[model samples]
Target: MRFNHFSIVDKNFDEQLAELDQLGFRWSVFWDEKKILKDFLIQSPSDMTALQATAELDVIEFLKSSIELDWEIFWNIALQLLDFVPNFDFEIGKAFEYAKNSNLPQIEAEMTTENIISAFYYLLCTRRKTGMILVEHWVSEGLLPLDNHYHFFNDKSLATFDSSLLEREVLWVESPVDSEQRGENDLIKIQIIRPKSTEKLPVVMTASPYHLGINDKANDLALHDMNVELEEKTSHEIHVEQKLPQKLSAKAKELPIVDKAPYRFTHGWTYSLNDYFLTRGFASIYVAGVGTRSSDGFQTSGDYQQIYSMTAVIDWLNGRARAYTSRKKTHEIKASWANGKVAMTGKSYLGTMAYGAATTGVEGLELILAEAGISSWYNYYRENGLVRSPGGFPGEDLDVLAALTYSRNLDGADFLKGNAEYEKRLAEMTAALDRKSGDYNQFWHDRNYLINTDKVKADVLIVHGLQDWNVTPEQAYNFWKALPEGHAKHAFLHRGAHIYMNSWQSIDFSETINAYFVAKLLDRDLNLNLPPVILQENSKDQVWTMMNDFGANTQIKLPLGKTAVSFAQFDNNYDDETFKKYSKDFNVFKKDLFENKANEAVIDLELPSMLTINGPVELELRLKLNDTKGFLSAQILDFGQKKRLEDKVRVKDFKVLDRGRNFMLDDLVELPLVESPYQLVTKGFTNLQNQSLLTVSDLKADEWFTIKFELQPTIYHLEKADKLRVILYSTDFEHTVRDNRKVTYEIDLSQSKLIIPIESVKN
Candidate 1:
């Protein structure tokens, strides 16, 4: 039965102190550096004696009634500090249980200073009258003044021992004022506690405000001024610099030009230049497109075009940087360079800025990475199938519309106020041209990087996301296929959702780029090898299998049709009789109701199979025309395994050759089909490759036209488990032809087959 620490929850602790003083208690205040009041110590010798007398008088009753109160408050505060105090619940409980069961001497021997403090807290929470005993202990231990400890009790309670000899100390707590600056607040309060026989007491202390004095003031001012200076420097650096000449100077000296065109200059050259030398330290340049307009007030220099270009490049660069950074630790190696050897390499649109510095014909460029970015705008727009107005399908048009809507100076208000009708007309014309054409003309071909592979002298690292619904993978693949042997070229086909780098699914491209530059430009040995190619084995599993390259041996074949029934019979004929029946089914013909098989059959092959070729593949066919013209489609099949089950490698229609120039009864033609050393790779399936060559011939003029054909160069692999399947079908839409009459044709397998030109190479 003793007095211990006490406290009250309130907005201001000092106000509580003043209230306590009005009750005839004396107290003093102590403050820390933060100027916030913490605790209160009260003094009252007579009051202390009265409180202890009352407690002893009803010890059993008081203990019974106060047990619940103590447990609740003590547990509440103890739980709050659980993050810092491990096993607090068990430790506090154990200490309390020991205190309750032991005698005074035993408790003294077993209970340490911390346990005594815990007991004091428990008592203070359960019985507020214990404050005086705790305060007295704090005063004796030099934590507070002895005259300040006080206690309040029920009226008329007098202790047997004289109360005049006892001393007391009262500590005062106070509230803090708001600080004008950050990090200067008086938010924290502290208290010092001293233990007594069965309780503990706390002396209040307040925190003073945190301020930057003479010692720290200089550094603060320096930082502030430096920030201001940096802002001004950054603002001034916003303009583009033109140090390189547009054309070759007569003196053969470098000519610097500071251009101020938004899309042409800012996005193409200036932006990349700044990123390299200022932001990233990777040298870059820009190449203008044929459709690119340098002057202002022109359609090409319109706001939409400018905005789209800048946004696109910024997005692309950011995406590229992110991709490059994501890599397995084992694949990453430290680079050697002033800023670490990493370069943003690209060509044409990308190349002009990404690898633009290399155009000077100097060496030092590390990686030559380019996609379908443009080098020459004129060639890209006019020479290629990409028309001036019609870019492509949903892609080109969508980009155009996006640019038109969001370009600077051409906001929504501007568009509404200006020539809206003309804009509509322009859009209509563009759409018309796009819908009318399906041919891969020179205009489309010019956009390909393959046309300028020779000029690419840097370590070639080419990639194309196959699911690029915009620019086809054909563009990148063409360049890769044309690259000279022994060139340091690597091609990657990722399955993702777009042409921009953001949607691609691959490892950190940034690390790959960094490693490329470190190894090639900086001459450092940063190993950056790639994982094995994940080829699609089957379309059913949505899983990809790994392989080094098109397996040890591969072969492909193409067949032509003599008659519609003959072609159908060859493909769908499961047995010899069925083949003959289908071959004869097309013998009888009707005028407008001429019939032919609409579907093509696919032959799926099993794994661990190989096909050997005897010589070059040849295609021979005889075609007669009742009409004038038609198309023939043929393809090869390879089982594929891919991440997305829908994507697999099946060459349904590889090549289509035009047929029937004149409506003659019999006209024969022979054609040579090119073949690749490697087979067609598919995702998600077992190993397989397919090649298809087909020709459409003989349109009927008066009666039925029949044509026979043969494929050449028969080849066989040593492994017999490998199977060869052939498919044939019409290329034209049923409604587009005369009477929807399908052509008649047959495959003379005896004359047409595949030949393998076998050769040996050193590993």
Candidate 2:
């Protein structure tokens, strides 16, 4: 099983695969990707002549058989991939070796793949472009058909696809001088994957707190996962560019562009998104913040500390920040190839960071795809005045989240000097985000991007789940509403609770994003078939519809000639199981609580047509409290509806796992291992004593007062015959602060109402 500079030759191929499989399987880099081999078999390498007749026959038979590929069998075909090393430049060999035999318990896989073609790149030439050097030895030849996602995109830039085009590098970039902490946080980790080109190209950068931000083993496993997925999705080519390049005019088949859809990837490694962008002639860049990985800084979250650190990396991209390859080599890394335009993207923490960086109105960042991201830290940590954990745990809040995201050390290269200093700094950060009072303060406000949208200069794209309970629709809605007019912004709200944009809406969804990116990054005119708001309906299948505004509310006056209800205070026994049950079917809370005071105001209003409710449902109370303070909870439900559903689709079902740093997506549910009759739409809370951005807390106890609060934003189909209901109560046993002061209220039934944003669907 000896290796050569150009290839891993000899009859030892099978032996090579066995070792590779054992190593990768133990590390979780390889999985059962049976479908990938099938995609290649689906289409015979259209041009087997690219290889020798004998070699071509071997590949054709390999593709035709149902044989699970092992290392030996695969070597006979992709033998040309004898060019590069260290899986995708995103991971290292020795690190994978360490994780293989480390003290960590072996990660056994119930889902596995035969290690053949999967590990060949790592064993031989794995650089995507380097593999193309063996193009003649390959089976799936030329380009597969362009995916439908490119249907609406301009084809001029992508007339042909290049199978033999890829180059990568790992560099240490100097971020801007840490304005707040001197030189403590300046260096950043940068990993670039791009087409081997002569002309400088634009970038599709994924600057995040995860992946490269984590340890080498974490990224190494992810890199393998991405490659595994790439094989699964595109059978013949690494990236499936639209149509056959051979079918195009020679000129059309020339330089720097492609139109393709990625296959199975990114549950760990992000090659799926990377391949998608790379096919379009953009460089796939992965970056981590200062203090993380090989960089210098202290890790923390939910503050300008994070926003500034990340933005410094963006500055470096536009030729402003500083960088170095070594301590003695302090040099400026000018993105000499950059087009001066950047797209900030990622999911969850990165999604939230994307919003944070954009709020700084950083230059070169043209737009953002904030998927299930945070808009208001207060909304995320403390809903109204009551605090709740991000994943249903009682004590989980901002400080905890900040601590978790601060995975970077003061200087990861040297542990003794680095970790100790970072610990002290970390304690200060932890204290800064403390939520002892569970009150809205500067700590929470500093983390909230909703208030800072006024400074955001780039266009925005809000991708959220209508049922997303983690970052919730409030995350996107609050920021979208706050963004000043004159910006080209839109929201693509989907049906699942905290899901990927593609899971619900596929090609059409990616195309809409393409329109935004093309216009912003390429500076070209491309019309997209998208509305300002794309709403996903609540149904058996996730269906997306459109609306004009998320905040354009129409007050549908409720009829309550004379209605009043009283609530009592009691401590309710609760835990994870109990909370989930209550969160799903309110009847649990409905029965135990003095359910009567939880007033249910039902209003049946026939829609002029099928109305699309785009934003959060607002429940208003025009009543005067007997005391100066009162604590309460509110809910808006779909009453009198014939149909119900399992509203949330757990993200885990669609993704593969990597490190113990599990992705925080209960931004709905944890997972389905799988929908139900779910009508409860949203929940909200308020402290009558506190001041709000709504400014309604100034209500005098004796005087008639107006208390208006909102439920989580959602997209629900309101049939003309259906009825809506709003429930508000001063005492909620599920929470700690139930108003026990024996509170009373004076109500003006005529003035109270439910405000909903409604628009009719036209034929």
In order, what lDDT does every prediction score? 0.27, 0.50
The per-residue C-alpha lDDT of model 1 at residue 569 equals 23
Over all chains combined, what TM-score does candidate 1 have?
0.35
Lowest lDDT block of 10, candidate 2? 224-233
Candidate 1 residue-wise lDDT, 576-675, digit = tens: 4433343233222111112224334233334343443322233333332233433333333332322222222222121111011110111111111223
Give residue 422's lDDT in candidate 1 (0 to 100). Answer: 32
Off by over 4 Å in 2: 1-165, 177-185, 212-268, 327-334, 391-393, 409-415, 503-507, 540-542, 560-611, 622-629, 640-645, 648-675, 691-706, 730-752, 760-763
Model 2 misses residue 561 by how many Å? 6.0
